[PDB]
Amino acid sequence: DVGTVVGIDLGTTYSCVGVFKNGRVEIIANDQGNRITPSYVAFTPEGERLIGDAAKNQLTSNPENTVFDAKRLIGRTWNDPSVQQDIKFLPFKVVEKKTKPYIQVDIGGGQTKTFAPEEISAMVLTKMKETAEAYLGKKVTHAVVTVPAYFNDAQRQATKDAGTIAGLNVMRIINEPTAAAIAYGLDKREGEKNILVFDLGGGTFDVSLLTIDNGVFEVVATNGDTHLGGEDFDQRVMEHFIKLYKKKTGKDVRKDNRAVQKLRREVEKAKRALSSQHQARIEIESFYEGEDFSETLTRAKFEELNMDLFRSTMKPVQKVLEDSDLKKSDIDEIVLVGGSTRIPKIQQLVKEFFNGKEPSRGINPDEAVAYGAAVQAGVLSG
Ligand SMILES: N#Cc1ccc(COC[C@H]2O[C@@H](n3c(NCc4ccc(Cl)c(Cl)c4)nc4c(N)ncnc43)[C@H](O)[C@@H]2O)cc1
Ligand SMILES: [Mg+2]
């Protein structure tokens, strides 16, 4: 009946699925060979739905009908101030329907359709379910799904509802920082500890203070920045190169959406290289007006352009400690989650804040949450 329960991190920008099979957690790659699937859905004018990288890669060509960031809207009402602010930054249409922010898209043949946020998340969960079934060689009916620790009752229920729509019985809703702590085996220890989970992803920043007492977790405080992540650091670098190009050539490349997207792709790759080396060459064939682009970005320049944003991650950490009535020295483990925690300056700032205390390392920060969800899914599969 419940079979092999899957563990899914349903992220704002990226989702990840794991299972417990043959004595260990296995993070599952999708049909594109990727252990992460972008939380994107594109509606083509042929009536087809594209999910994941297939959808993300077609954003520039179909900017009104490619849906992403549905997690920012799920479990909220249309008139929630957070929703009214977020819709200002989203390129697809959002309308009031049944008190909620429904996403409106063209599906071809002169038809437009509206989808609740949980229906978009259900499409992402269906893909995660397909990924898991291809791996296991059998059907998947049950899941453990993670949510941000600050999610309220409506946000947790709407996430279980996205599972129902996808044909998944969401047996447990688990907090993302708790799932990361479980990945590190922090739940399998005698005694009591205070854990700070610092999660800096592609688009969001979450800090959580947890207590662990002989396998029992409590989320004591949460903070962060809802609109700070890796995409913001790429954007600072894009603006930098766009201004330098305008001063050198007198050309504003922002007029050509394709040129901007080629630059975005290469800037993101260069930022990644800058986590292990000190210079990165950005090369673009036929960037603008058919002319090739070839420039270098140093790690020093990358840090300067982003120094305020990197430093900003420190105030939510201090605030969670104040709200927990804990001192820096009371923190027993610092767990880094989210792909942006690979940035050396971010790791430096976290270590400096904690007076030289080394954070927990070793588990891929993009996968730690799904890994913890898979550990719990293994217990439930029996
Ligand atoms: N393949 C793949 C893939 C794996 C994980 C992710 C999730 O990334 C979340 C965020 O994390 C960022 N990030 C990541 N993300 C992981 C990643 C690894 C490989 C690839 Cl091809 C891509 Cl593109 C992304 N690695 C970073 C690094 N070394 N230095 C700085 N930032 C890094 C990334 O730019 C994004 O903003 C996205 C794609
Ligand atoms: Mg995450």
Strand order from edge to edge, sheet including 216-225: 216-225, 205-213, 192-200, 333-337
Domain at 290, CATH number: 3.90.640.10
- Answer yes or no: do 57 and 184 share one domain: yes
Best probe residue, ligand 1, of 12, 16, 31, 36 (max atoms within 8 Å of C-beta): 36
Q: Ligand 1 pocket, 342 CB below 6 A?
A: yes
- Answer yes or no: do 153 and 283 share one domain: no
In angstroms, rounded to a whole number, what is the distance separating the alpha carbons of residues 206 and 224? 4
Query: Helices H, strands E: what count in the chain?
Result: 11, 18
In angstroms, rounded to a whole number, what is the distance separating the alpha carbons of residues 318 and 295? 38
- Answer yes or no: do 53 and 131 share one domain: yes
**Last residue of one domain, picked from the residues 83, 107, 123:** 123
- Measure CA 252 to chain center: 31
- Measure CA 28 to chain center: 17
* Residue positions annotated with a catalytic role: 9, 71, 176, 199
Cβ atoms of 303 and 345 closer than 8 Å: yes
List the determination method: X-ray
Beta strand ranges found along the chain (DSSP E): 6-10, 14-21, 24-27, 37-38, 41-43, 49-51, 66-67, 93-97, 100-108, 111-115, 142-147, 169-175, 192-200, 205-213, 216-225, 279-288, 291-298, 333-337
Cβ atoms of 363 and 25 closer than 8 Å: no
- Answer yes or no: do 129 and 155 share one domain: yes
Q: How many CB atoms lie within 10 A of CB 50?
A: 19
Which residue segment(s) compose the domain that 104 sits in? 68-123
Domain at 354, CATH number: 3.30.420.40
How does strand 333-337 pair with strand 192-200?
parallel
- Answer yes or no: do 275 and 341 share one domain: no
Nearest ligand to the C-alpha atom of residue 264:
1
| Nearest Cα to Cα of residue 205 among 221, 224, 232 | 224
- Answer yes or no: do 211 and 112 share one domain: no
> What is residue 195's three-state secondary structure?
strand
- Answer yes or no: do 146 and 285 share one domain: no
- Answer yes or no: do 118 and 131 share one domain: no
**Last residue of one domain, picked from the residues 276, 295, 312:** 312
In angstroms, rounded to a whole number, what is the distance separating the alpha carbons of residues 139 and 47? 26
N-terminal to C-terminal alpha carbon distance within the chain: 12
Q: Using CA atoms in the order 48, 50, 56, 62, what is the torsion angle rounded to 10 degrees?
A: 0
Nearest ligand to the C-alpha atom of residue 232:
1
- Answer yes or no: do 235 and 291 share one domain: yes
- Answer yes or no: do 235 and 305 share one domain: yes
Q: Ligand 1 pocket, 272 CB below 6 A?
A: yes
Q: Ligand 1 pocket, 14 CB below 6 A?
A: yes
Helices 117-136 & 153-165 angle (0-180, nearest 10) = 50
For 289, the token pair is 């007006």
Q: How far is the CA of 145 from the centre of ligand 2 (A)?
A: 12
- Answer yes or no: do 145 and 181 share one domain: yes
Domains held by the chain: number: 4
Cβ atoms of 178 and 149 closer than 8 Å: yes
- Answer yes or no: do 352 and 381 share one domain: no
For the chain, the 3-state helix, strand and coil shares in percent, each to the nearest 5, are: 40, 30, 30
